């Protein structure tokens, strides 16, 4: 499903992402926008054999198990296909684990290249939350 910006902001707020471990809500909307264009079914096959899944493009080498990625660690303890749902629950649970590492949101390459250092609260302005 393709979320609207304000729609996603209100959902991510409901899923407890506003100020989770020091990251204001706008970070998460901005990251979704550049990682997947707000599409919960987005998938991206990498050159190393892994695949990035869903709205936050969570990687099958470290985070979820898709059964086809060589040294998969399955850190979120979840099948990757659970991240391709229009309900964002599993993606948000996994993301909270990811961001609890000392790397924080630098795990998301598009966030790091297009969001960090910008006025990320601009992604939630103009929205009823």
């Amino acid at each position, epitope marked *: 499903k393709v979320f609207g910006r304000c729609e996603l902001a209100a959902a991510m707020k409901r899923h407890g992402l506003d100020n989770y471990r020091g990251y204001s809500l706008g970070n998460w909307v901005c990251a979704a926008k550049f990682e997947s264009n707000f599409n919960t079914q987005a998938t991206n096959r990498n050159t190393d054999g892994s695949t990035d899944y869903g709205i936050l493009q969570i990687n099958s080498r470290w985070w979820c198990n898709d059964g086809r990625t060589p040294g998969s660690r399955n850190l979120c303890n979840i099948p990757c296909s659970a991240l391709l749902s229009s309900d964002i629950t599993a993606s948000v649970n996994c993301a909270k684990k990811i961001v*609890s590492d000392g790397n924080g949101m630098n795990a998301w390459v598009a966030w790091r290249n297009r969001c960090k250092g910008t006025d990320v609260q601009a992604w939630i302005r103009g929205c009823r939350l």
Partner: antibody
Amino acid sequence: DVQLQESGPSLVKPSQTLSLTCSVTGDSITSAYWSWIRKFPGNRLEYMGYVSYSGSTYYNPSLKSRISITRDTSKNQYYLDLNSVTTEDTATYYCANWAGDYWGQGTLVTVSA
Amino acid sequence: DIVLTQSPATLSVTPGNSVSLSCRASQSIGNNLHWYQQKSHESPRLLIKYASQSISGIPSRFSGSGSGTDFTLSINSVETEDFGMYFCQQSNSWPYTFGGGTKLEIK
């Protein structure tokens, strides 16, 4: 099925370093984030810290930096070192995964001269 | 640090009644609140995560609800195996903290 089990001394002296070990059976230590938690005598729980997959550590500031958590992939164990213990460090210590589903049985450590 | 206050500190109840325990946070923590049970001579057991998400292997009489600062754990029809201590825990901010606990015991 993963199993966790604490070990170390049950009695220590004031000002020494307490060292505990958590052995993991069932999966590799590289597949989770790992933590130490302790329970004081009138049921107060304290989250001590955890080590995540990059090796970064987070420590509770109530411990005033006397703690260190390290892991040993080879032995599939991770450790707790608590320096300069006092009688206030008497407690039951548990290791557990960050997600909170797997806990060891807990070990009581008493600090006394 | 976020402080978590639980109430009541102790609740006595007859098997078969329904009870509700409360956990209040000193700041808004969204849905980042988990509940643990601790029976005598046992290590904590995770019952509910993220305020209301169910966990496989736990009786379905346990349910959780709330957001922001006010959270509740409900036990529909208490059984004798439910007696023990209940704690809430927040993982919104580092250091993670626990509430002081509620003791559930036979009336």
